[PDB]
Design a protein around this ligand. Structure first.
Ligand code: OIY
Ligand code: OIY
Lengths: 109, 142, 117, 54, 103
RNA sequence: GUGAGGGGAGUGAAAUAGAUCCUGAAACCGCAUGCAUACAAGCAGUGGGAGCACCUUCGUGGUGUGACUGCGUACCUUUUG
RNA sequence: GCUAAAACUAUGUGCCGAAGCUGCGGAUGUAUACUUUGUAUACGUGGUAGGGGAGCGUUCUGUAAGCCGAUGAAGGUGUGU
RNA sequence: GGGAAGCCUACCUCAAGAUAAGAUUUCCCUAGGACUUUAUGUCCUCUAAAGAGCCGUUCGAGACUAGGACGUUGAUAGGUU
């Protein structure tokens, strides 16, 4: 029985967030929290928010113990993109894609 | 599916020892290649190694006919510009006799992973002794 | 009477992609590449249904040659001897017996060389 | 200069096979008991006994 | 004990109780077929090789039924020449169970 | 973070009908399991074929994978080609 | 790799070798005779530009105030045939 | 037998991914149960060696790396004299 939290619409690319997700996949929650607390990556903040939300859900909605939990499942999906126009030299224009992502964290005994 | 292929786990490799004293190089190499590939067994299968182990002794006593001892050339290329190296049979048989047999049999075996595996079953020695007494090779007069 | 193409076109593309299962990369995902890959597979199969008979006959001949040389004959001489002895067993059965029954193959070779003599 | 053929997803992932992150060196501070970065002052201002902020 | 029989333009090496598929025959399902043109009979050390055939030998089999093999696609295509045609095929067979072999 | 977002609760026939919300395909991008893969050269398949995993009417069976091997230089157009 | 050849000349006996020919099974076109037949026999069935013949599926109108459908239509996604 | 600035050696550097993966010296690890898939077998408990790395002070070594030295039993860097 895994407990899920989802953070949707995080303003960061999935490719960047997956690097942080792979770092904590499969570890105990205390170890993962230490790693996220001392990381310098921007995606670490978002992943830590999702993990803490999942732990709180497991504690309050399902009455599980903190000490036995681990990151049993985590993956990052691509969200909706924002489209913008960047003017280049000599009257040429390029299209800019501002990417977002969805983070799913599951904790299980 | 009435015609059966040989199974690698059921193949039996037998050990034979051949003396090269006075034999013609190519006419010995054809028989060695045949027995390494397993063409002499009724369970022969093109994609399975069914051959035997061959130990060649007295490798530097092998002979070539005509004037090939001085005229037959062995080439290699270091891939640097102008890097073509050349030698002949007379020098090579005195220096590295096993390389002559390796070339002669490699040219007659199939070119691929199975051929690479097949040629690993040939052991060539210059002297009259070999270190494989534990495998009890049988004398094979080919 | 306006006709929309979507349902039938989707069905045709899906059938092609289903036949292209297991291929590498775009060959199992992209319709154009997959369609080129299926036709070529059919062409190869048509050619190889003919090649298979030759390959299996070659295998039978090689095994018969090995058995005959174990019994003291060459393949060509053993075939000639069987022909003169009137035996009409084919190469598939001859190779099967050579592989699985050495005594029977020895008897066949003896018959062949007796007819040759 | 630009590619003549689009690169496959397999080759792209093969190039990315060196992109994984690593952990920092963390350690329990014996003076205070909290996890801290090794050789660094803790977030509360402690380092090997001395305390920085009264 | 095994025997060599002719069926459908091809040859088979059979033992008692064997089930095998041959070219389509006109016999009704459940009937018995008798091969009286046996080419070879081997029973242990007893080996009989027919001159064309082994005189006196018989092989009896029972017809189990008839069926069709798996479908084959035939594809022909001449590149750059605007030509292409296809067809399917399923080959009929008759299934036999060997019940008796007598030298 | 009195944010965004989510987990419960509740409404509803239905919430994976939850607000750019009927259905929800493809390109494209993740996670999980099974097998293969770090001594071997090319349109990537095709005809053979060992082993392994799951299932099984226990098999001359089904599903997935595919060591090793014969053959094999995309499609369209325009052209004498 | 090959030298009383695995080279050249002459002779002989075997064998390999194609989608050619034969064997077994199946489809289809034309004609003769069976004086409906759907039947046997004989001869055919590589194809660009082209010519001829026969069909599959899609949307709409009548048949249809019929027939199927919340005990689940269309559409989507698998499996079997 | 003699016979050239030419060939193989000889001189310098690299070199066992030489998958044929070579050699020598020295060092380290000597615990219990259950079960069946009876085997370098699968799960529990116990154990964590010789060494290697992370980190830090750095370099006549350096794009990042890699490589060299040192980490209180200390002169590795800065300062001080
Ligand atoms: C002979 N005339 C020389 C010439 O052509 N000079 C201009 C070079 C044009 C170039 N070859 C084509 C180009 O860049 N098209 C883009 C394109 O349509 C679109 O951008 C994307 N990304 O799709 C759009 C964004 O809204 O911007 C256009 N470009 C624009 N250039 C503009 C500018 O400078 N002022 C006003 C307005 O004209 C702007 N839009
Ligand atoms: N278990 C999980 C539990 C988690 C926890 N609980 C947390 C949680 O739960 N958080 C909830 C967050 C949800 C979300 N953030 C909140 C949100 O979105 N509020 C939206 C608030 C304002 C909203 N935009 C206004 C709106 O709807 N205007 C539309 C709009 O003008 C137009 O519509 C379209 N399409 O053009 C029009 C056409 O009809 O209709 C109007 N509307 C109508 N309504 C009427 C109707 O029904 N009949 C009659 C007529 O009056 C109808 N018109």
């Amino acid at each position: 029985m895994e407990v899920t939290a989802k953070l949707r619409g995080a303003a960061i690319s999935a490719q960047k967030a997956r690097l942080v997700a792979d770092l904590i996949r499969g570890k105990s929650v205390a170890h993962a929290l230490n790693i996220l607390n001392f990381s310098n990556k921007k995606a670490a903040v978002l992943v830590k928010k999702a993990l803490e939300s999942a732990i709180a859900n497991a504690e309050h909605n399902n009455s599980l113990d903190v000490d036995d939990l681990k990151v049993s499942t985590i993956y990052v999906d691509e969200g909706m993109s924002l489209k913008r126009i960047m003017p280049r030299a000599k009257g040429r224009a390029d299209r800019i894609t501002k990417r977002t992502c969805h983070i799913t964290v599951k904790v299980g005994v | 599916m009435k015609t059966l292929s040989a199974k690698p786990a059921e193949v039996q490799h037998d050990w034979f020892v051949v003396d090269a004293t006075g034999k013609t190089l190519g006419r010995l190499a054809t028989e060695i290649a045949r027995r390494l590939r397993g063409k002499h067994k009724t369970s022969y299968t093109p994609h399975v190694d069914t051959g035997d182990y061959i130990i060649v002794i007295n490798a530097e006593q092998v002979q070539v006919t005509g004037n090939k001892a001085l005229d037959k050339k062995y080439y290699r290329h270091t891939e640097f510009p102008g890097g073509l190296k050349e030698t002949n049979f007379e020098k090579l048989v005195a220096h590295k006799p096993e390389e002559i047999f390796e070339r002669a049999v490699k040219g007659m075996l199939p070119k691929g992973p199975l051929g690479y595996a097949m040629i690993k079953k040939m052991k060539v020695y210059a002297g009259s002794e070999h270190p494989h007494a534990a495998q009890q090779p049988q004398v094979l007069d080919i | 009477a306006r006709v929309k193409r979507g349902v039938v076109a989707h069905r045709r593309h899906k059938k092609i992609l289903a036949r292209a299962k297991g291929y590498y990369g775009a060959r199992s995902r992209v319709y154009r590449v997959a369609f080129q890959a299926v036709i070529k597979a059919g062409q190869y199969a048509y050619r190889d249904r003919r090649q298979k008979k030759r390959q299996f006959r070659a295998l039978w001949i090689a095994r018969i040659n090995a058995g005959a040389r174990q019994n003291g004959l060459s393949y060509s001489r053993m075939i000639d001897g069987l022909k003169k002895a009137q035996v009409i067993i084919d190469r598939r059965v001859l190779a099967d017996i050579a592989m699985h029954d050495a005594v029977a193959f020895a008897a066949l070779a003896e018959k062949a060389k007796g007819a040759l003599a | 200069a630009v590619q003549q053929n689009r690169k496959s997803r397999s080759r792209r992932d093969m190039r990315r096979s060196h992109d994984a992150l690593t952990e920092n060196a963390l350690t329990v501070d014996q003076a205070t008991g909290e996890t801290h970065r090794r050789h660094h002052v803790t977030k509360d201002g402690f380092y090997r006994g001395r305390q920085l902020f009264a | 004990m095994y025997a060599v029989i002719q069926s459908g333009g091809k040859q088979h090496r059979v033992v008692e109780g064997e089930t095998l598929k041959v070219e389509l025959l006109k016999a009704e399902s459940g009937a018995t077929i008798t091969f009286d043109d046996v080419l070879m009979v081997v029973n242990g050390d007893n080996i009989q090789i027919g001159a064309p055939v082994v005189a006196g030998a018989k092989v009896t089999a029972e017809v189990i039924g008839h069926g069709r093999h798996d479908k084959i696609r035939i594809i022909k295509m001449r590149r750059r020449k605007h030509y292409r045609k296809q067809q399917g095929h399923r080959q009929w067979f008759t299934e036999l169970k060997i019940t008796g072999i007598s030298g």
